[PDB]
Amino acid sequence: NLQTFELPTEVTGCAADISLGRALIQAWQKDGIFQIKTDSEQDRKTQEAMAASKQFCKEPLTFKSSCVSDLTYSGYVASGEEVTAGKPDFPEIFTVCKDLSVGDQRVKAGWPCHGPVPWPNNTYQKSMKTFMEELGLAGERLLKLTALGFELPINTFTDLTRDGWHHMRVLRFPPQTSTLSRGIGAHTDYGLLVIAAQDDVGGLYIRPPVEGEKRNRNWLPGESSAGMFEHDEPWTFVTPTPGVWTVFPGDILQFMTGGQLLSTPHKVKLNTRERFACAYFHEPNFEASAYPLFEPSANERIHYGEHFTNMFMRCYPDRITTQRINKENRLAHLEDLKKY
Ligand SMILES: NC(=[NH2+])NCCC[C@H](N)C(=O)O
Ligand SMILES: [Mn+2]
């Protein structure tokens, strides 16, 4: 059974705040996951986002496929389009990244992944943007409490999430209709926090920390966490529970804390019913460089925007976003943006 916490509206660093940060870290180090209780507005905006999702998914595939961009990875993923560990995942997804128009200087400069969300409609954009502003507030709470539990300056993590690369995967998993029950393969997500909401059907499994088990550093090439431990136990079932979001660490948190926190492996199993979920990613700024918090002398850095772009090219190798990245070689502009 998971732990559920209520976050304070504002995190000031008082002793109850430091206590709470201590407990979240502990929960992460034991269960690899915990729940935060939602208030009425957070819940209402979660239900609106789900309702918008189901509506969008009823639309014919040609319409849904039309919501795609060669500037940004925001938009539609068909069931079967995403690749995990060499195998296609089967949900339909609408990814929402930072919604930047063609009038933004980063977009003008051809920065990779920077571009406008191909929204199906304005009502869907309102619901999604209202949901993510609430998720973002919760992520900043969480990041301040985490740094407090680690006896770090309160702003240690929030300093990297100014204009952060926050994004969300709006997922619809189909019922299991074939021999394959694999919804999404065992993977780790790429930022600091993942905050997820869930319908009543159920199907997400997460892997807790295991003593002495090696966890791949998904930010290195040749240490991809994609597919690791998929058919080895233990795997906790995240029971659908009304009035909560779940939170677990992403790749940046694992790197920065030198493994005190682990980027939680998770997978999804197709159920007898279609299953709706939203996964929110509280990320650093695109130009932020993560650093090891407990090894000052260590030179390792993770330029977060390079990690995001790498990740999203390996998910979507044939998507028009990726083609244009290859065509104009915007990975080179990424190295330029590091220096000029
Ligand atoms: N864009 C994502 N969050 N994808 C999550 C699934 C894992 C992804 N297919 C990978 O290979 O890393
Ligand atoms: Mn995930």
Residue 317, phi-psi category: left (phi > 0), alpha (psi -120 to 50), beta (remainder):
alpha
The values of phi and psi at residue 311, to 5°, are -55, -50
**Contacts with 107 (C-beta within 8 Å, 6 or more apart), sequence order:** 71, 100, 101, 114, 115, 116
Of 187, 192, 310, 321, the one to substitute when testing ligand 1's pocket (max ligand atoms within 8 A of C-beta) is 187
Task: Compute the distance between CA of residue 265 and CA of residue 140 in angstroms, rounded to an integer.
Answer: 23
Q: Where are the domains of the chain?
A: 1-340
Nearest to 173 by CA among 196, 198, 194: 198
What is the spatial distance between Cα 282 and Cα 164, in angstroms, rounded to a whole number?
A: 7
**Distance (Å) from CA 17 to ligand 1 centroid:** 33
Query: What determination technique applies here?
Result: X-ray
Q: What is the DSSP string of 223-265?
A: ---TTTTTTSS--EE----TTEEEEEE-HHHHHHTTTSS----
Locate the ligand 1 atom nearest the alpha carbon of residue 225 and give its number. 12
Report the distance separating Cα 7 and Cα 11, nearest Å.
9
DSSP code at position 99: B
List, as one string, the DSSP characters of 179-202.
S--EEEEEE--SSSEEEEEE-SS-
| Identity of the residue numbered 12 | T
Return residues with CB closer than 5 A to ligand 2 (ion): 189
State the Cα–Cα distance between residues 120 and 56, nearest whole angstrom: 7
Q: Determine the straight-line distance between the first and last CA of the chain, rounded to whole angstroms.
A: 50
Nearest CA to ligand 1 atom 9: 84
**CA–CA dist 280, 97 (Å, integer):** 10
Alpha-helical segments (H) within the chain: 15-31, 40-57, 61-66, 105-108, 122-149, 251-256, 304-315, 320-327, 330-339
Structure tokens at 303: 């330029």
Strand partners, 37: 244
In angstroms, what is the span from residue 240 Cα to ligand 1's centroid? 22
Q: Residue written as tokens 């919501």? A: 67
> For 113, phi and psi rounded to 5 degrees?
70, -5
User: 152 and 18 in contact (C-beta within 8 Å)?
Assistant: no
Q: Of 126, 174, 108, 109, nearest to 117 (Cα)?
A: 126
Burial of 134 (0-12, 13-18, 19+ CB in 10 A): buried
Are residues 270 and 174 in contact, defined by beta-carbon separation less than 8 angstroms? Answer: yes
29, 130, 188, 235, 266 from 210: Cα distances, Å: 9, 37, 15, 11, 14
Q: Which residue has the tokens 């009425």?
A: 40
Exposed (0-12), middle (13-18) or buried (19+): which is 178, by Cβ within 10 Å? exposed
